[PDB]
Amino acid sequence: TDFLTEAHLDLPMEFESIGKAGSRLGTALAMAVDHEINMVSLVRNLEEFFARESCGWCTPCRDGLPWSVKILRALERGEGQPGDIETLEQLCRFLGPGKTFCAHAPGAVEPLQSAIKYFREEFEAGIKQPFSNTHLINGIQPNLLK
Amino acid sequence: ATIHVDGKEYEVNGADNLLEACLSLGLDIPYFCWHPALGSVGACRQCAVKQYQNAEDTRGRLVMSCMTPASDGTFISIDDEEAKQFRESVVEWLMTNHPHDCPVCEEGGNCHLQDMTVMTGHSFRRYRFTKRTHRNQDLGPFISHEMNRCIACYRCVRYYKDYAGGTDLGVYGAHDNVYFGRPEDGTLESEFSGNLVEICPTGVFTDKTHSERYNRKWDMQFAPSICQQCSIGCNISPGERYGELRRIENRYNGTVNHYFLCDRGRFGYGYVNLKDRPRQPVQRRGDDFITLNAEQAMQGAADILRQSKKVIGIGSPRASVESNFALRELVGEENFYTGIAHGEQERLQLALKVLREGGIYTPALREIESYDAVLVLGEDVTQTGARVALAVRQAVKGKAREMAAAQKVADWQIAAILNIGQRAKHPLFVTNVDDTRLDDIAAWTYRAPVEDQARLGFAIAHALDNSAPAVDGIEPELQSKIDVIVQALAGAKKPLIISGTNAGSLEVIQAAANVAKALKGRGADVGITMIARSVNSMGLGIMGGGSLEEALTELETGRADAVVVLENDLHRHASATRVNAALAKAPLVMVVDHQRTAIMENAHLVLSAASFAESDGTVINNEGRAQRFFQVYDPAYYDSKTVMLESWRWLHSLHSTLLSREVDWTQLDHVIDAVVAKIPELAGIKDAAPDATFRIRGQKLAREPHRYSGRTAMRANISVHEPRQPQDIDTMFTFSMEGNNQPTAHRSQVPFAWAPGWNSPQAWNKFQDEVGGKLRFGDPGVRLFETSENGLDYFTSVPARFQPQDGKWRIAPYYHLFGSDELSQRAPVFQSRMPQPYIKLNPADAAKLGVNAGTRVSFSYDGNTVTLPVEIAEGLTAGQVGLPMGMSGIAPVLAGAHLEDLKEA
Amino acid sequence: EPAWQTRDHLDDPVIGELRNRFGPDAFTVQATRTGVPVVWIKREQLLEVGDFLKKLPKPYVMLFDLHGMDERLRTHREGLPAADFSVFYHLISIDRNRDIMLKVALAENDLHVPTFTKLFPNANWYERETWDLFGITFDGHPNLRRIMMPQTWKGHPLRKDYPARATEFSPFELTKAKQDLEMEALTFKPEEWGMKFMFLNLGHGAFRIVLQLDGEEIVDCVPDIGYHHRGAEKMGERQSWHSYIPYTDRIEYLGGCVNEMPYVLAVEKLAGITVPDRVNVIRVMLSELFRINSHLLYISTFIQDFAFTDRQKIYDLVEAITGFRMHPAWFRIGGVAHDLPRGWDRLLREFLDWMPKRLASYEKAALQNTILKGRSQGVAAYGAKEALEWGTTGAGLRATGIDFDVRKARPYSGYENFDFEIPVGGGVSDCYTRVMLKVEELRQSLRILEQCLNNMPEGPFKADHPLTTPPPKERTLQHIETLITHFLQVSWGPVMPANESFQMIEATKGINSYYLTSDGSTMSYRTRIRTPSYAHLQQIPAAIRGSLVSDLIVYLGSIDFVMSDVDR
Ligand code: SF4
Numbered sequence A: 001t002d003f004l005t006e007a008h009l010d011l012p013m014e015f016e017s018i019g020k021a022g023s024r025l026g027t028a029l030a031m032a033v034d035h036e037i038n039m040v041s042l043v044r045n046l047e048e049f050f051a052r053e054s055c056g057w058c059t060p061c062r063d064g065l066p067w068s069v070k071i072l073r074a075l076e077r078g079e080g081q082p083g084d085i086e087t088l089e090q091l092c093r094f095l096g097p098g099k100t101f102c103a104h105a106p107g108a109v110e111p112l113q114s115a116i117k118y119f120r121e122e123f124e125a126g127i128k129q130p131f132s133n134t135h136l137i138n139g140i141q142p143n144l145l146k
Numbered sequence B: 001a002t003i004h005v006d007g008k009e010y011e012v013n014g015a016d017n018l019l020e021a022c023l024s025l026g027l028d029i030p031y032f033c034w035h036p037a038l039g040s041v042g043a044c045r046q047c048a049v050k051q052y053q054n055a056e057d058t059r060g061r062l063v064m065s066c067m068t069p070a071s072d073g074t075f076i077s078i079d080d081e082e083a084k085q086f087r088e089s090v091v092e093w094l095m096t097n098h099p100h101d102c103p104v105c106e107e108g109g110n111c112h113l114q115d116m117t118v119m120t121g122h123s124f125r126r127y128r129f130t131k132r133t134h135r136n137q138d139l140g141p142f143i144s145h146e147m148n149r150c151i152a153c154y155r156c157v158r159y160y161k162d163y164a165g166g167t168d169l170g171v172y173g174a175h176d177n178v179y180f181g182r183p184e185d186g187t188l189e190s191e192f193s194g195n196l197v198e199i200c201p202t203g204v205f206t207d208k209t210h211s212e213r214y215n216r217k218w219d220m221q222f223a224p225s226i227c228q229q230c231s232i233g234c235n236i237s238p239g240e241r242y243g244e245l246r247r248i249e250n251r252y253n254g255t256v257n258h259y260f261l262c263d264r265g266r267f268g269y270g271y272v273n274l275k276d277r278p279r280q281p282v283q284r285r286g287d288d289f290i291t292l293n294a295e296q297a298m299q300g301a302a303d304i305l306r307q308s309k310k311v312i313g314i315g316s317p318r319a320s321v322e323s324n325f326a327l328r329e330l331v332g333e334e335n336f337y338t339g340i341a342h343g344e345q346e347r348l349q350l351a352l353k354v355l356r357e358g359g360i361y362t363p364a365l366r367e368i369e370s371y372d373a374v375l376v377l378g379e380d381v382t383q384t385g386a387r388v389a390l391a392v393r394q395a396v397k398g399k400a401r402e403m404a405a406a407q408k409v410a411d412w413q414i415a416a417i418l419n420i421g422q423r424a425k426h427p428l429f430v431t432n433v434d435d436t437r438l439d440d441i442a443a444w445t446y447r448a449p450v451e452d453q454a455r456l457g458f459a460i461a462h463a464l465d466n467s468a469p470a471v472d473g474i475e476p477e478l479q480s481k482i483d484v485i486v487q488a489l490a491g492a493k494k495p496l497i498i499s500g501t502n503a504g505s506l507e508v509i510q511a512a513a514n515v516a517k518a519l520k521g522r523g524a525d526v527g528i529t530m531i532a533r534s535v536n537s538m539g540l541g542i543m544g545g546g547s548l549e550e551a552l553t554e555l556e557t558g559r560a561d562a563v564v565v566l567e568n569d570l571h572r573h574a575s576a577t578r579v580n581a582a583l584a585k586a587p588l589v590m591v592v593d594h595q596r597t598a599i600m601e602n603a604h605l606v607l608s609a610a611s612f613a614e615s616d617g618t619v620i621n622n623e624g625r626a627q628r629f630f631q632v633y634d635p636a637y638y639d640s641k642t643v644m645l646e647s648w649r650w651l652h653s654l655h656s657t658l659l660s661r662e663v664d665w666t667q668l669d670h671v672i673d674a675v676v677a678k679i680p681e682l683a684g685i686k687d688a689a690p691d692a693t694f695r696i697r698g699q700k701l702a703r704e705p706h707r708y709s710g711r712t713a714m715r716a717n718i719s720v721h722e723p724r725q726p727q728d729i730d731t732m733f734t735f736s737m738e739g740n741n742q743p744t745a746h747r748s749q750v751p752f753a754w755a756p757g758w759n760s761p762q763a764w765n766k767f768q769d770e771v772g773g774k775l776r777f778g779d780p781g782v783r784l785f786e787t788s789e790n791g792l793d794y795f796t797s798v799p800a801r802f803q804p805q806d807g808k809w810r811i812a813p814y815y816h817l818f819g820s821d822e823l824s825q826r827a828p829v830f831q832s833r834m835p836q837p838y839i840k841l842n843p844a845d846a847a848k849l850g851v852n853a854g855t856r857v858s859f860s861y862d863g864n865t866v867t868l869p870v871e872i873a874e875g876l877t878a879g880q881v882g883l884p885m886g887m888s889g890i891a892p893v894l895a896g897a898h899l900e901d902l903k904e905a
Numbered sequence C: 001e002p003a004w005q006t007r008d009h010l011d012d013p014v015i016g017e018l019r020n021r022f023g024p025d026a027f028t029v030q031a032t033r034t035g036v037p038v039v040w041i042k043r044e045q046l047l048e049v050g051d052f053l054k055k056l057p058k059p060y061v062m063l064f065d066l067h068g069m070d071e072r073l074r075t076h077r078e079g080l081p082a083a084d085f086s087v088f089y090h091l092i093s094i095d096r097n098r099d100i101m102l103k104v105a106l107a108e109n110d111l112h113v114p115t116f117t118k119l120f121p122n123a124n125w126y127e128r129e130t131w132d133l134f135g136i137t138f139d140g141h142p143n144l145r146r147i148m149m150p151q152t153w154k155g156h157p158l159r160k161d162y163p164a165r166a167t168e169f170s171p172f173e174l175t176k177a178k179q180d181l182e183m184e185a186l187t188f189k190p191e192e193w194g195m196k197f198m199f200l201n202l203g204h205g206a207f208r209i210v211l212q213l214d215g216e217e218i219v220d221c222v223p224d225i226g227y228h229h230r231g232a233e234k235m236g237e238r239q240s241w242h243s244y245i246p247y248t249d250r251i252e253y254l255g256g257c258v259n260e261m262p263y264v265l266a267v268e269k270l271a272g273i274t275v276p277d278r279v280n281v282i283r284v285m286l287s288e289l290f291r292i293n294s295h296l297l298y299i300s301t302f303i304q305d306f307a308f309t310d311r312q313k314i315y316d317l318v319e320a321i322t323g324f325r326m327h328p329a330w331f332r333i334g335g336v337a338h339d340l341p342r343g344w345d346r347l348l349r350e351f352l353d354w355m356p357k358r359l360a361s362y363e364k365a366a367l368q369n370t371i372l373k374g375r376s377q378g379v380a381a382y383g384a385k386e387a388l389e390w391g392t393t394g395a396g397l398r399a400t401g402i403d404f405d406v407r408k409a410r411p412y413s414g415y416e417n418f419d420f421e422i423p424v425g426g427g428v429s430d431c432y433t434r435v436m437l438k439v440e441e442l443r444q445s446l447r448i449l450e451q452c453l454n455n456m457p458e459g460p461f462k463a464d465h466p467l468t469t470p471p472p473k474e475r476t477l478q479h480i481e482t483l484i485t486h487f488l489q490v491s492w493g494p495v496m497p498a499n500e501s502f503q504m505i506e507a508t509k510g511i512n513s514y515y516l517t518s519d520g521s522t523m524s525y526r527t528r529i530r531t532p533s534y535a536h537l538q539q540i541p542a543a544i545r546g547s548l549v550s551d552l553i554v555y556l557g558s559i560d561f562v563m564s565d566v567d568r
């Protein structure tokens, strides 16, 4: 289920009330996260669970949840690179209902998109190194894209 | 129905899903997990389009076109930006763990994943993390395994398990460590495992025989040919390179063998590449072997044949219709002998009479899959006619298809079909001397001698219709199982009766004809299918002639002083001692063949015939469909000393030099016209393919792709000067890329599938009228005979019960897919695949002999004591001894023959 | 809005004028990526449409091109009339700075079009070549004979059912051709060649002209061309889009990258590729270097009728950049093959510090040499009327006072960013006027090179498009998607979706243009190359009438043609 802030705490625990806030009522067993818990570490743990409890049937969950897991590990270690948060956002948009074979992956990407929506500063604080995907090959001049 | 794709209106079938409907129209949607023959499961999530609710809808919703029905008034968009971005994202997700292997990958230039990576326009890698790896398995001699390249699309398991009925290939593991393969290292046990090299859209399963001598698809010279390995007549695309046959790809024929071959046809081509094949005419002189060219061989053979008082011809069911006809014209109709045994010919002629005079429609191979009940009498189909066994498996799954169709479930939603049809299936009743490979799906299996199987068939026929002859001496439990078969066949809308000449019993064929006639008399839509032995058994039976024993008597009595043997080793159809004595007695033996056979030691002249890869011709399959196979390459292009002509060309020029003392290398169409003039029954071979003057808007048909490479360096080691392009005057194809291979070309003979953007075997989608259906502008090949207006009579010759007498062992035939076809045995990759020759014994017979499993026993047949190790066969009945037909020393003529003096060695 | 977008050009005023004149159902407008309106005209209305376009308020005055096309194998004919063959006429209006392409559809058995030589006299050789390579007869044509093939040639080589490859060589055909060519001077027939007084054969390139002389005066001359026919367009149908770039190089061999440029721009129109600015600057720089080289050779050859060291400096610079002197084969679909080597700017700076003194020397050798002024002025001259009707472009057209340069009128490859002038002659195309225009063009190319050197973009040398062929090499060597794209692009070929594209550029001899038809495949369905040397060589019998043979030699030396450009 999506994370909610303390401003959403004054809200009845009904299906339509939580749904209109941008979440799901779910099993109505709420979990409270205090201030000293890092949001990136919490979502990293959640995505590790969701990416190892995938059944492996369909490509977006099977091959896109581990990519989000690796990105969140990099953001944990301060080894994130520019474009990682954009990759997480695109993964959240492309693992929604109907894109994947079952509803495991929408429920997987709900905490990620909610924590990006409400706690974006920590994910941006995870990015501390320039984007490098290649290595220089001696003899070949690279294509310096702008 | 009516669909609106990107603002354009199309009329499609409403029973189709959106992916196959749009692919039939020519719209390009990427797809991985969907296959036309396997249905839709929605795994790979690659086929995404945007479906709108109505015409004035702007938001839409991303759906999978393979899982979405093509209902009436359906508005979708393929080239919408969100759909394109999602499809590119799916390609990128597949690319995150994919290895950097394309230069060293056998599927490169042939890879559906390459084509769909390019088609979605994904070329920039922004994933920077580690790629998951995997360890490979050893899958045997044929299929190479490379699990790194897997995109987890489940095509292999769906084909191999749900379609092919195999049991030793599954998916293991979890979230993204999914693994595909066997539970342990070992050979894949399916007879149709070789179709994985085209089912898999990546390089996980590759053709290991092609991998040992590898070249890319653009370097291949392809031709449309017919598989020569059994009688079914599956269309193949043999591709060569550097003068050797490199690969057999499947050639789509929506009537016969649509997407699938068997492993014999796919991997038993290696006899063409043997280094002991005849390549020049060789004439013996005392102990010397003088090599002649074409004209010297023809003049010398014509002189010696002119001096001889009577020359007889021995054809073969391996040779084409044209070659057997040319031999018949050379020696005369009365001096032409079909080079098969008398009992084999009698069974073949009876099967022909049933097919073209029994008044019952004989189905094509794809049409077999639409029948509601199958009775297989005597024919071990999986080892003799394997594609029919695959079609029978589909016809058996038809009951689950029907049950799901009752609940308004679409026919492509295969997972729901298999869920509804849990273990319910259409009735299958197989009879054999032992256990078949169809026993896992058969409703009942009858292990019995051929007399008892024929008696069971006659009892079924009598219980279906009392006008049929009755069978006396049926046990009550066997009678109850007879009643079960009768209740299953009488309630079936489309019953199918499959028999053949491989059981070695005339009465099995008679019983099958009786069952089919009894089902026809009740008004059922019955079909019958006979399985012959060789590629042109049916054509040689139609042409006719004497048996091999008659020709042996002619040679032994001295009435024939010259024999021309065409593509016949002569030991598979008669005893080797008698053949050797008759051929050593004859003062002139001339052997026209493409394989080094044992009778070439007794030959005065050996003419180097061409195999199917170096010759054109026509063969008739088990259903009576004339099919033209075209030459793949010129053998003289790389080696200028090679004189390897067609068998009909050798024999026609020999006839011309015999009559007029001048050599006439004729054309293929002249021989076709001669066949359809002299033999009216074979008049349909004229329409099997168009003649050599056929053009597509003025230009010929190309044998090789447009990007064929090395054209100025492939022979540069011999000479730097390029030779002439080989002229093909026999057929409409050309030996170059200067030709036509467009998917929208008005032709039926397609050498290979290639379209721009589609380099894989999924390029066949562009060459069909609708995907998974007929080939566009019709499938190649024509049926020779129509269904007769009136049928046969009931065969009243009911055999007695099999009785085991002491000192006489009835030989029960055990056929093997790898080892019972002669040219397949010659292929070196089958040596590692074929089993060791075991002689099968009942536990009671081996206990009476005192023999245990593995002790070598000797038996004498035709005064030849041969020893084989014993395997205990429980399902074999007592008094019978099981032998592997076709293997080393054991001829198929021994099927049903008695055995004497079976002692421990 | 992209410049490669498929447009219909229904907002062109010529379409409305044609609708008002012939009616809306008299023609079919085709949406292409050529950048011109493509109008399918009925065969009977062709001369009427030509008359109407010749008499517009700002008329279409130059037949830029005329050629055939075999449509029998084209599968994507959506929105086109049913045609087995077609003939396209590319007409240019300079007052409107526009152009139109009229296509005439033809059935396979009725292959005859009315002649266009009454309207445009330069259509003579184009119709001869269309007859030669397609078998399309032109009714009313004076001498419709083969222009690229010998007269004893069977079949038409650009038809789709003609074998492209060389057939088996035979010494018997060589001896027969020797007997045919070596008895021409003895058994000459002065009616096949279009003539009707002594007959001479002469024997930039080697080619033969049949001359008819009254004493030493030339009263009739018929060029015999096709001796250097390489079948480059038929090869365009045989190579992929990527592996045809060397063949574009080998046409007008003094041009090099200049000849590569219109081909890659047309393919990029087919592929929908907008190249980045550094690609545009690099391709402009190399085309200007090769333009300077060609102008230097032309000036040195004319002055002959010291200058070969500057050509060596240019060749050393191009060798450093590309790796090859005169056939660099270096432009790619979506960019160039490699990046500029580290140290190129030093070589260019040393070249531009060497050229002003040499250019002053050339101006002293051409202006102060009044013997050359006397022997060059008035030698086979023509005005703007003769330049328009014969399709003369480049230095001759601008020497007739018509200010039409492609780099300014229809700018390409980022020539808008460069400040350079277009030298225009007084109104008479002398040899001297054309040579002076070449000198001033050389000065303007030096100015363009200075502006390139002083302001060089730092960026990519290949586009960020999926159809950029090949992809950047380092990403090919370490990324699987890029490796896959490289694998499929260099082997099967890049797939251009089915369209027609056209690019016209200013070559070193005039206006060069590629017209590419893609049928959705990895090769070209049709490649049409319009070269200016063809139209320049057609104008010789219209200008050298009544002149001396020495005047013919000087005029041939001052045309600035190459024979491989003629016979393409
Ligand atoms: S989204 Fe569901 S069906 Fe797809 S892989 Fe994940 S758990 Fe399996």
Ligand code: SF4
Binding pocket: B098, B099, B100, B101, B102, B105, B106, B107, B108, B109, B111, B112, B113, B114, B149, B201, B202, B203, B204, C484
């Ligand atoms: S499976 Fe396809 S994409 Fe993967 S390495 Fe092989 S050719 Fe390349």
Ligand code: SF4
Binding pocket: B149, B150, B151, B152, B153, B154, B155, B156, B157, B180, B199, B200, B201, B202, B204, B205
């Ligand atoms: S092994 Fe091949 S067919 Fe099987 S899931 Fe992987 S990619 Fe698909």
Ligand code: SF4
Binding pocket: B227, B228, B229, B230, B231, B232, B233, B234, B257, B261, B262, B263, B264, B265, B266, B385, B386, B387, B388
């Ligand atoms: S079933 Fe017979 S014809 Fe078909 S591939 Fe197998 S051996 Fe060949």
Ligand code: FES
Binding pocket: B019, B030, B031, B032, B033, B034, B041, B042, B043, B044, B045, B046, B047, B064, B065, B066, B067
């Ligand atoms: S092809 Fe439809 S999801 Fe795989």
Ligand SMILES: [Ca+2]
Binding pocket: B614, B615, B616, B631, B728, B730, B731
């Ligand atoms: Ca042949």
